[PDB]
Each structure stands twice: as C-alpha cells, then as structure tokens.
C-alpha cells in the first residue's frame, strides 16, 4: 500500500513490456515456428502487446502437456526425482572473454548491441537469427546451485568455451525461457565431446550410446521444447525421467534414483542427458553476481572482445604492439586500433616491420594496406594511416590479390566513403 508498492508495480509492468517486445520478435520473425504451428502475428503498432507473453505461456503449457501425457503414471522413484528437481534452484552462467562487470555486471543482447552501434546498414542476417530469432536474449548455461564445490561446475555449452570470464547469477528471471538444448541445434553430441565424460565412462555403460539423441517434442524432430520460468523445472524433470526409463543401464538408473542424490551428481546428469539453455530478455544488469576467471586469454581474443585491461597488460613493447595492431585490423576492431595508435606512436618503419611479421596470421598473409581497405569498419584507421602518411595510397599489393590497390578493396565492399577518400588522396 506504500508508494514503494506502486513504483514496484510500475517497474514490473515495464520489465514485462521489454520481455514482451523480445518474445514478439522471437515468435513473429522465427521461420521455424510457422511449421510447428507455434508462430504469432506481428505487432500491429510500433510495439507489441502482452499477447507474446500469453503465447509464451501457451506454448509452455503445450509442451508440458505433451511430456505429461507421455508418462502420466509416475512411479515412486520418478516422483522423488521430480520433487528433487522441482525444489532445486539454479545458477546461470554466461562466459565471455570481455570484462562485462565492474561494480555492476551488465550483459546486453545481440540486438541491443546492434541498436547501440547505430551502424547505417544491416548486413545479411545469419540463419539462427532468422530461424529462431532469439537474438534479443542473453544466453546462459544452467547448473545446480546447492553445492559448495568450485563455482563453475560446467565450463562448456554445446562443447563451446564462450570465454574465459564466467559470470554467474543465482536468481531466476521472471520472463526468461528454457530449452533442453540449444534453440538452434537440437542435437546432443557423442560422449567424446562432453566435458565430464570421465565420470560417466568410469561408472556407467549403455547410456554412453543412449545419451546422444535428438531431444524433441512429439511433433517430430526440429520441435524444440520451450518452457517458461514457471514451468521449466517440471519439464526438465519429466524429459529426464523419460530418457532414464528408455535407458537400459541399471547403474545410471539407480544413480539418478538414489534418494540421497548428490547435487553435483544431479548437475552432471543434467549436463549429460541435456544441455539446458536459459534466455533472459534484452539486457541483464545486476549487483548480485560472481565472476570467475577460468583461464588466461590470448592477445587476439582480447582484441576481439575489446578487453582493454588484458590488452594494456599484454601490449607493453612496440614489437607486441605490431601484433596487436595486426590483430585489430584483421578482426575489424577499429576503436581498439585507434587506442593502440594513440598509446603507441607508429612510424613507417613500424609498418615495414609489420610486413615482415611471419608469426602473425594477418600480416604474414595480407599486405597491411589490404588489411586497411578490406572493410569499411577500418575507415577511421585507414584515414589515420593516410593523413599521417604512414602508407602510400597508390601502393600495389604484393601478397594477396597482387597488383590490386586499396581502391579495389573499396570497390569490392561498395563503400563510397572509402572510394572518395582514396580518390581525392
């Protein structure tokens, strides 16, 4: 009844609206949804109503009913495991090579980053962005939390290490959604690709060849189960008990049906049988988080992630700055390149020494002028290199596409700004 209560209702409403926009994008721009009878109409006006959220709840109810009818009678061990998973809370992990956390951890979605850069044109849309359109969601791996082992229990999602820094949150988001695998890839790999394969190889048998299986709804393959935050635990548990009943390894069955099952063991089982993926709409900004540095990162991964801290630590000499600027131009990270150009003063002899770099991939393969002209993103640094006279405009390439000049790369990328710049200079 206090004014705080009304402000809380207001902000809950606005967060609901943000999530509604994200889910409307996903359900209207997703081509795979139309074949599965799960598609949704586009927003009539500028924004979308809560009908995307009720559609999310409807498809969650659909998948819950599909898995409940598959096993309506439940045994005692099945229901005991179901209660264990229903009452267990999750940790959600996002891995990146970038520094996403200071006093506060702020992770943004793909679409938010696009809208923030305000690049003039839209490059060709990738298949995932088109088939699932989950690109306004921050993605997370899922682990069990009632453990006191080292916090990153699992370090790989779809056998991919998405970064050295692991950011972990311990609270469910009210408007996130869970899938049993990747929303794009609905297949789990063989055992040789699983991180914690040693435990299962040592203690379990036929599950090794039973675990690699398309996890799909009754509509068939490519039917990815979607569960909302309220229904996720039940769906996870029911699909898990379906798989366990299908399994012939009695050891695995009685391990996952142990009444006093270990939480870390349960996480191993859920990371084995499934590869759960959690999605929080648009941004994720909180003060309650844990940051774990799993490993050191390479200078090139640092340039790609724009991790200025690791860059400054690793780039201390001009010979290392040559590598850094090469990796910046090759990976089209113009701002990092300009930071390096201000912090280190580069001369023409520096570019000559960069041309001789055989350790670096980009400079050993390509001419530096080629690297400057390849994409419009490097325009600024190109400008810097030409206004400061570090490279001559009419220089003919001697490594890749020999005989061509930077004007040719400009005409390939169809960037009129680069063409005008090169023509007048």
């Amino acid at each position: 009844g206090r004014p705080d209560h009304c402000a809380n209702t207001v902000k809950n409403f606005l967060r609901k609206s943000i999530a509604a926009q994200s889910y409307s994008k996903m359900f209207s721009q997703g081509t795979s949804f139309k074949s599965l009878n799960l598609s949704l109409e586009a927003p009539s006006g500028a924004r979308s109503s809560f009908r995307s959220l009720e559609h999310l709840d409807k498809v969650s109810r659909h998948y819950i009913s599909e898995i409940i009818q598959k096993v309506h009678p439940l045994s005692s061990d099945e229901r005991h495991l179901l209660s264990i998973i229903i009452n267990s809370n999750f940790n959600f992990r996002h891995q990146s090579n970038s520094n996403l956390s200071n006093n506060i951890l702020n992770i943004k979605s793909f679409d938010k980053i696009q809208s923030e850069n305000i690049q003039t044109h839209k490059n060709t849309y990738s298949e995932d962005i088109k088939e699932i359109s989950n690109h306004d969601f921050v993605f997370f791996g899922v682990e069990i939390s009632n453990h006191q082992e080292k916090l990153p229990l699992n370090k790989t999602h779809h056998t991919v290490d998405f970064g050295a820094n692991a950011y972990i949150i311990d609270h469910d988001s009210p408007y996130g959604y869970m899938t049993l695998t990747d929303h794009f890839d609905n297949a789990i790999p063989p055992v040789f690709y699983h991180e914690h394969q040693s435990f299962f190889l040592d203690n379990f048998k036929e599950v090794v060849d039973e675990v690699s299986r398309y996890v799909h709804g009754n509509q068939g393959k490519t039917d990815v189960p979607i569960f909302n935050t309220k229904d996720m635990r039940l769906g996870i548990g029911l699909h898990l008990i379906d798989f366990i009943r299908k399994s012939k390894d009695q050891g695995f069955r009685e391990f996952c049906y142990n009444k006093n099952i270990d939480p870390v063991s349960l996480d191993r089982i859920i990371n084995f049988v499934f590869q759960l993926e959690y999605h929080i709409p648009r941004m994720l900004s909180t003060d309650n988080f844990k940051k774990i540095k799993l490993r050191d990162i390479s200078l090139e991964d640092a340039i790609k992630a724009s991790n200025y801290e690791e860059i400054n630590n690793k780039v201390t000499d001009k010979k290392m700055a040559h590598q850094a600027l090469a990796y910046s131009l090759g990976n089209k990270k113009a701002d990092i390149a300009l930071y390096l150009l201000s912090k280190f003063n580069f001369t023409k002899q520096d570019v000559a020494e960069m041309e001789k770099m055989k350790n670096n991939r980009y400079c050993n393969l390509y001419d530096v002028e080629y690297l400057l002209s390849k994409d419009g993103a490097n325009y600024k640094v190109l400008e810097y290199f030409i206004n400061n006279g570090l490279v001559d405009v009419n220089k003919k390439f001697q490594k890749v596409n020999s005989g061509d000049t930077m004007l040719d790369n400009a005409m390939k990328s169809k960037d009129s700004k680069m063409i005008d710049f090169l023509l007048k200079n």
Partner: protein, 242 residues
C-alpha cells in the same frame, strides 16, 4: 618442421626403378613450380566464411614446403576467377615446372564454385568444366603430360574432353556451411597433416586415401572427401626436400 622430407637416395632409387610408373621430376636447380589458391571469404548475398585465413595460411605453407611458389587471390567474382585461372595457365614458369596445385575454397553448388556477387536470382558461378577446360592438353601446353592437382572445398561430343583432359586429379570436400571450427577446416587440417607425415614415402593418391581413412569415424563418415575426375595414368610422388 612438421613436413617430413624424403631421403635423397630413395628419391634417386624410385626415379630410376619405377620411372615408367611415376611422373618425372624436374631438378630443384632451375625449377619454377607454381601453385594457386583462390578463396572467397566475404559474399554480397551469402553468409561469410570464417576460418578461411587459417586454411589459406596452412595450404600456402604446405605448398611452399613442397617447393611451390604460391599465388593467393581472395574475394573474386566468377568472371575474375576465370580470368585468374586463365592467366595462371598461361604463366610460362610452368614450362620450367613439373606439376601444379589449384586450391579453390568458397561456397558452391553441384555444377561449380560460387563467386562473391552470387545470388539465387542472378547466379555467379565458375563451372568445374570451365576449370578443366582452361588447363587441358590443348589450352595449356606448359602443363601437358604433367600432373594437375585440384583441391576443392565447397559448402552446401563431350568425348573430346576425355581426350584432352589428361593427368587431372580432384580432391573435393562438401561439408555444409555450419556443422565447425572458426579456427580452421577439418578437411584442410587433415590434408595438411597427412601430407606432412606421409608425403615422404607415399604418392599423392595414397596420401588422399589416408585422409579419407582419417574421415572413417562414424561422426565424420558423412563428410568424407571424394576423389573425382581422375585423369592420371602414373603416380605422383612429391619427394619433399628434393
């Protein structure tokens, strides 16, 4: 370093005893072996191909360890690819050479490889038959009766040909666009390693067969590389280090 070299005495012995069964080798002195790598990474109307730089560098270093001078062309249209191959075939260093390698890497269809400005509504493709025509015994006298190796990596009457398209071999990979590594390709990586460890003792096709055997796992048998348009009648020992 990784490329194992064939001992010189074995080179002499195999050239003497099985000369009628292998392609002749020009002396390292005054030899001008050339190889060409065409690779399209950025496309106007198609998804980008990443990790191609790793494959370019690996293929370049391997071909140079095999004593080939490598030309590398990137982001070319189909017409520019045809012109580049035609120019390479009229390169006259091939007269002082004994073989050639053509590594073509891009997206592709069944009929040919895709250029940069390619779309389903207006296609931009270099046909494989065009490639084999440009280098046949009639249009490329410098490489007549010399082995011609075409490594292709793609994603997603005519009897005259059988008389003029001689001494060709094609090793083709057709792994889909996204299946893997952003730091390489499994086909190019396996090829480089098999060359590095088996070129010293086995001929080109034996190395190709060992690549194929490396793809015999149940998870990789689907993307097995294929040997196509074999016009060879002798065996090509690359005799590395000689």
């Amino acid at each position: 370093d990784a490329l194992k070299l064939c001992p010189h005495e074995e080179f002499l012995r195999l050239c003497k005893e099985r000369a009628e069964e292998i392609y002749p080798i020009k002396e390292r002195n005054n030899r001008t072996r050339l190889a060409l790598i065409i690779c399209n990474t950025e496309f106007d109307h198609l998804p980008p191909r990443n990790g191609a730089d790793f494959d370019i560098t690996g293929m370049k270093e391997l071909l140079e360890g095999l004593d080939y001078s490598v030309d590398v062309e990137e982001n070319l249209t189909a017409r520019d690819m045809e012109s580049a191959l035609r120019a390479f075939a009229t390169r006259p260093e091939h007269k002082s050479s004994d073989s050639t390698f053509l590594v073509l890497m891009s997206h592709g269809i069944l009929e040919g490889i895709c250029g940069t400005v390619h779309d389903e509504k207006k296609p931009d493709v270099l046909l494989y038959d065009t490639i084999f025509q440009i280098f046949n015994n009639r249009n490329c006298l410098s490489l007549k009766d010399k082995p011609k190796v075409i490594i292709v990596q793609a994603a997603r009457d005519a009897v005259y040909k059988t008389h003029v398209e001689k001494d060709f071999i094609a090793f083709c990979s057709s792994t889909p666009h996204n299946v893997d590594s952003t730091m390489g390709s499994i086909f190019i990586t396996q090829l480089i390693t098999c060359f590095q460890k088996y070129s010293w003792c086995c001929h080109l096709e034996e190395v190709f067969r060992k690549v194929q055997q490396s793809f015999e796992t149940p998870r990789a048998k689907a993307q097995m590389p294929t040997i196509e348009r074999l016009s060879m009648t002798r065996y090509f020992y690359l005799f590395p280090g000689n």
